[PDB]
Design a binder for these strands. Structure first.
Lengths: 81, 150, 91, 226, 97, 96, 127, 25
RNA sequence: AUUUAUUGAAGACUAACUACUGCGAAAGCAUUUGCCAAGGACGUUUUCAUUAAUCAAGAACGAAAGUUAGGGGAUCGAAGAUGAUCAGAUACCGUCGUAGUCUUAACCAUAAACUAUGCCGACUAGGGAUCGGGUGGUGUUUUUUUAAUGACCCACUCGGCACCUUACGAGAAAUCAAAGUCUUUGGGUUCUGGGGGGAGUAUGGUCGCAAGGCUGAAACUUAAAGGAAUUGACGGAAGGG
């Protein structure tokens, strides 16, 4: 294409690209508030975690890790941030 | 471009534009610092410490949460290791491949790979000995390294 | 310093007996005079006394083995195959 | 070539059919077609004992012959000569095997073959080497052309197959094994085991070989021919 | 000059392929380079089919086939007319009719 | 793994090496854990088992020899036995 | 009902053997080959000679009393050509048309996994 | 001639030169 | 004998699946299972911080053949023996067959070792397929109809092995997504070539047990050799008449 507004692209294109190709690289991950049942102990958790995190109570494990994101256990109240 | 192979992979991180983080975490610099020293006090490395802090506490990265980075913090609170972390892992992997060789003398692929590992060792050691985190007269030698890993 | 290029322990044999035979003896002479590791104490105090008598001065033990080395490869294969069949029969 | 031979005798007829007698071979209780064929042997002089000279034998016959059907056509059973009782002699199992044309038919490319083997003992003192063949398959709704597996899938499929084989035969005696290979329950056990790995069609069983038997046990063999 | 783009074979990112032997001449030729075909042929060859059907003890008989892959060298392929030489414009038809 | 937990005690906790100092500590009850190499005299091995039986201490056998165990603790000699007197920081006594 | 033999044809290039035997196999009946029929070393593999041998063994086995046969076709295989000669189809058609009853046609050619070595040099047979 | 056989002719020739020159010394 | 049937032993090999498919620095790597360490890509709001690129000297690995000593030694088979065919045939073709082919320890250091295309970085036409990781879609199918997971479908992405079409551009042409961004000549570095032969020969070092490898001329001779295409002629090359 001869011309295009590279200084002001569309949200859909910059969401489509790799995160190292946008006009200013920024992460496509996120954080999340999560709570296992029982005690509240409202805990922050990372998307691509690499760990098996729990609450201070005991082994009440929240997010088992995987090569990309972390797979959360079934009974977990979680929420974007 | 990724010296000891022919791959041109770019699997890296992308630290955001927000140099003052993160608008929801309102705890204190002293709290993350005591947490850092607690993890370093059970004997963890700065990489694993930042990993843990990130994926368990609200810590984007210590350099913006605190005013500085984790290795600086550990050097200042007295948990400054004898040598750098990455050099330590290269020496560990070196002695591992070495013992593999000594028990299995025909893994020529592993002899080659050991050569490349030790080349990398020597290069990072040269950088450290020029910028004074290590002293000159330091040198990788094999049995002393097998001892130094602890 | 470094005295000899390639005769090593077979420079006591001088110019005699032919280079090839001096080369073959060299391999085994190194092997038989060397110190080895005692399995019982871990120390480097094992030496040959006589053909297939390998004794450790520190821990005062003696093990039977090859005439020129302390573990011959033939006997190594036998150890492994004995271990296989011994585990299998009690199982 | 009729007149080419340079020597017929470097050393310096009667018809064997009149000298030979017929015999009639039967299957075990585990196959509905008992009567399967006949065979020949020289007349039992006191010098030879044709009974034992005939004992040293085996016969391959098709499982379609042995089950009246046409779906069992592609599997053949070798039955060994183990007992002779007065001109209605009997056999017992020696080994299953497919027909090479069926085997060569299911194998084709742009799919993935998988094969497992087990060297396991049975409950009744035999020791058998069984094999198992499995293929991958294009799903319905799939559009790619080949449907190749990913080899970690293959070690897992191999493991679950092999443990099913060992599990079954360790507890199933020889006759029980024969009785459970005619319906091919093993194939449905495999497919219900493996549908969380790969779709995996063509899951038939494959040959099975007595590697060293026990003592004869004439009572058990006659128990089979009750 | 380079007569072809794949040099008469199929090797990219390998550097080596174990050989196969031909079937007419039995020349040791690589696998990717060979003239593999596939014979799937009724054993009766379609002439004796009627005779075997009538002489069968059982009708509706499947009548199986010989299955076998055929590895050919370039020479024996070209000689037996399996493949044949093609114009400088129609060498590139990588699919058959 | 196991060598890292032992290294944490070497850095943080305290310990004593060798047969004589170990059994001295074991008599006094001051020890918590003992590790014993596997190239070892079975008599000495069994004797420590008896001593730790009396003291009710725990015992662990190292997949290695005196030389290997010595490299683990960070010393440069043969160590057939090591006595943990207290760890402070590590979960060594808790795990395994 | 039907007495059964087995047909065992072996259609190698340069010779097409036929012989009939019991279901077990050790009881052999009437081995005949193409070369038994003709003179010339070339027509040993001729399908005419093959059908000649097929008809005589059909006659012999009928006068011994067989009725049907289960067929096993074979070729050289192993290291060599793995595909049959023309005498195969010829002999099987001939005995079929002879009137002996037919069942269970099957190929049992040795189709080896990972053979030793096929002869005739690396460069090949430079005919 | 063929380049390979040119190598073979020279090598056989060369080893003959070696041996004769060995004879004088 | 050939053949068929039941076993046995020995060694080698890893058919079919097997592909414009994977991995490896290259040579190379295909039955299963277990152990040993290694590696790429991906994911990362982890860590250190310019540690990097290419490299004379120098080292590691290096198909086959070959050498040294043990084992092993079935097929195949340099040498060698015989059958022939031939004018001759110690060449093709056939039947034997030693060295070898496998392995252990140590050497050899070449190959059309080729993608005949150095390595690192950037920018530039489209399109589809595919391998590995990742992201999203109440998507389909799967167990207990339906949770996960898995296997597919769709869309996107990063990294690969390559491909299809153009020809803006290049080239002597064949051709090429680089062999482009070069008389509008400059991103960084290494190695090599200067008409053909003589000649990778002689000599001298140097490495090797040897075979041989690395470096490596001169005299003398000659006006051509050589590359890619065009048209003809020819072919014990094919298709048609």
């Amino acid at each position: 294409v001869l011309v295009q507004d590279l200084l002001h692209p569309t949200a859909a294109s910059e969401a489509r690209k790799h995160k190292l190709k946008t006009l200013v690289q920024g992460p496509r991950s996120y954080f999340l508030d999560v709570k296992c049942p029982g005690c509240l102990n409202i805990t922050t958790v990372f998307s691509h975690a690499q760990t098996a995190v729990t609450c201070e109570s005991c082994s009440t494990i929240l997010c088992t890790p995987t090569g990309g994101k972390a797979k959360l256990s079934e009974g977990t109240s979680f929420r974007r941030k | 471009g990724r010296m000891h192979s022919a791959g041109k992979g770019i699997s890296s991180s992308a630290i955001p534009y927000s140099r003052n983080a993160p608008a929801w975490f309102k705890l204190s610099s002293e709290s993350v610092i005591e947490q850092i020293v607690k993890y370093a006090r059970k004997g963890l490395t700065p990489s694993q410490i930042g990993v843990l802090l990130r994926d368990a506490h609200g810590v984007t990265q210590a350099r913006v949460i605190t005013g500085n980075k984790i290795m600086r913090i550990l050097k200042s609170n007295g948990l400054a290791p004898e040598i750098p972390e990455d050099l330590y892992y290269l020496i560990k992997k070196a002695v591992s491949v070495r013992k593999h060789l000594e028990r299995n003398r025909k893994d020529k692929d592993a002899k080659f790979r050991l050569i490349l590992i030790e080349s990398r060792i020597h290069r990072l050691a040269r950088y450290y000995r020029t910028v004074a985190v290590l002293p000159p007269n330091w040198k990788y030698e094999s049995a002393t390294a097998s001892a130094l890993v602890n | 310093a470094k005295r000899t290029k390639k005769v090593g322990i077979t420079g006591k044999y001088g110019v005699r007996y032919g280079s090839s035979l001096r080369r073959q003896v060299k391999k085994l002479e190194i092997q038989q005079h060397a110190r080895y590791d005692c399995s019982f104490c871990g120390k480097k105090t094992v030496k040959r006394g006589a053909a297939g008598i390998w004794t450790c001065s520190c821990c005062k033990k003696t093990v039977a083995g090859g005439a020129y080395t302390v573990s011959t490869a033939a006997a190594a294969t036998v150890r492994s195959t004995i271990r296989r069949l011994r585990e299998m029969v009690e199982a | 070539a009729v007149g080419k031979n340079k020597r017929l005798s470097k050393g310096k007829v009667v018809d064997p059919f009149t000298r030979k007698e017929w015999f009639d071979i039967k299957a075990p209780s585990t196959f509905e077609n008992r009567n399967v064929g006949k065979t020949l042997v020289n007349k039992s002089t006191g010098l030879k004992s044709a009974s034992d000279a005939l004992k040293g034998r085996v016969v391959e016959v098709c499982l379609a012959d042995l089950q009246g059907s046409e779906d069992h056509s592609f599997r053949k059973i070798k039955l060994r000569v183990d007992e002779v009782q007065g001109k209605n002699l009997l056999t017992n199992f020696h080994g299953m095997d497919f027909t090479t044309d069926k085997l060569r038919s299911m194998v084709r490319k742009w799919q993935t073959l998988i094969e497992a083997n087990v060297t396991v003992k049975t409950s009744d003192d035999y020791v058998l080497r069984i094999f198992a063949i499995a293929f991958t398959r294009k799903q319905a709704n799939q559009v790619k052309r080949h449907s190749y597996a990913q080899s970690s899938h293959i070690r897992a499929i191999r493991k679950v197959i092999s443990e099913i084989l060992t599990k079954e035969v360790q507890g199933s005696t020889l006759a029980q094994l024969t009785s459970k290979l005619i319906p091919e329950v093993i194939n449905k056990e495999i497919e219900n085991a493996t549908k969380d790995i790969f779709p995996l069609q063509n899951i038939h069983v494959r040959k099975v070989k007595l590697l060293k038997q026990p003592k004869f046990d004439v009572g058990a063999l006659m128990a089979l021919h009750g | 000059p380079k007569k072809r783009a794949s040099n008469g074979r199929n090797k990219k990112g390998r550097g080596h392929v174990k050989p196969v032997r031909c079937v007419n001449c039995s020349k040791s030729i690589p696998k990717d380079k060979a003239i593999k075909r596939m014979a799937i042929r009724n054993i009766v060859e379609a002439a004796a089919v009627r005779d075997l059907s009538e002489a069968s003890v059982y009708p509706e008989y499947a009548l199986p086939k010989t299955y076998n892959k055929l590895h050919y060298c370039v020479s024996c392929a070209i000689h037996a007319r399996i493949v044949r030489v093609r114009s400088r414009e129609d060498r590139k038809n990588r699919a058959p009719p | 793994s196991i060598n890292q937990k032992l290294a944490l005690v070497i850095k943080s906790g305290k310990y004593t090496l060798g047969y004589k100092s170990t059994v001295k500590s074991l008599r006094q009850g001051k020890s918590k854990l003992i590790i014993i190499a596997a190239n070892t005299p079975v008599l000495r091995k069994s004797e420590l088992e008896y001593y730790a039986m009396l003291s009710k201490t725990k015992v662990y056998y190292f997949q290695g020899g005196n030389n290997e165990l010595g490299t683990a603790v960070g010393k440069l000699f043969r160590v057939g036995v090591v006595s943990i007197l207290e760890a402070g920081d590590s979960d060594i006594l808790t795990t395994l | 009902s039907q007495v059964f033999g087995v047909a065992r044809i072996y259609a190698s290039f340069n010779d097409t053997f036929v012989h009939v035997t019991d279901l077990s196999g050790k009881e052999t009946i009437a081995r005949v080959t193409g070369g038994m029929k003709v003179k010339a070393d070339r027509d040993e593999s001729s399908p005419y000679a093959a059908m000649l041998a097929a008809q005589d063994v059909a006659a012999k086995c009928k006068e011994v009393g067989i009725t049907a046969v289960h067929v096993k076709i074979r070729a050289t295989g192993g290291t060599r050509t793995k595909t049959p000669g023309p005498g195969g189809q010829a002999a099987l058609r001939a005995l079929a048309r002879s009137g002996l009853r037919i069942g269970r046609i099957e190929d049992v050619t040795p189709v080896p996994s990972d053979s030793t070595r096929k002869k005739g040099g690396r460069r090949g047979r430079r005919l | 001639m063929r380049a390979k056989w040119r190598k073979k002719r020279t090598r056989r020739l060369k080893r003959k030169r070696r041996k004769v020159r060995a004879r004088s010394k």
